[PDB]
Design a protein around this nucleic acid. Structure first.
Ligand SMILES: [K+]
Ligand SMILES: [K+]
Ligand SMILES: [Mg+2]
Ligand SMILES: [Mg+2]
Length: 135
RNA sequence: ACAU
DNA sequence: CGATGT
């Protein structure tokens, strides 16, 4: 119904899919960029969306913040809930880095706790998520 | 079909 | 138009 403005919003940006993947987290209210991941040479949209949420979890936990996280990705929200990123991306030398980060993100989820609500950004009602890459 |  | 996903 209503945007929870006291929140973190995340989004992925890519050059190709699969292709170069980056992501960032912003203050939903102000747009302030809170974290930005260095571009990853090959990954998928959904792996980036997943990494963005998990990074947001780690970011908020380190800062003792109970803010929720918004993502517009049905897929990544489910993957985080499951603690399992069910990507189809081939594992090879070229995809080694993104798969390493995804593996490590799952591992973090399986060794830490959090109460952070992970919320679906309702793009059809509210427009583009505040972390959008204007892409 | 829905979400990217 | 193509790809990633439930
Ligand atoms: K975009
Ligand atoms: K499809
Ligand atoms: Mg997105
Ligand atoms: Mg976007």
């Amino acid at each position: 119904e209503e945007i929870i403005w006291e929140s973190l919003s995340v989004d992925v940006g890519s050059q190709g899919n699969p292709g170069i993947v980056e992501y960032k987290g912003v203050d939903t209210k102000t747009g302030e960029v809170l974290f930005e991941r260095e571009p990853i040479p090959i990954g998928t949209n959904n792996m980036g969306e997943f990494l963005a949420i998990v990074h947001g979890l780690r970011y908020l936990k380190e800062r003792n913040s109970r803010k929720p996280i918004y993502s517009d990705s049905q897929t990544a929200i489910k993957w985080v809930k499951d603690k399992k990123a069910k990507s189809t991306l081939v594992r090879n030398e070229e995809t080694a880095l993104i798969w390493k980060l995804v593996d490590e993100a799952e591992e973090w989820l399986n060794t830490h706790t959090y109460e952070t609500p992970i919320l679906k950004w309702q793009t059809d009602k509210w427009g583009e998520i505040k972390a959008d890459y204007g892409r």
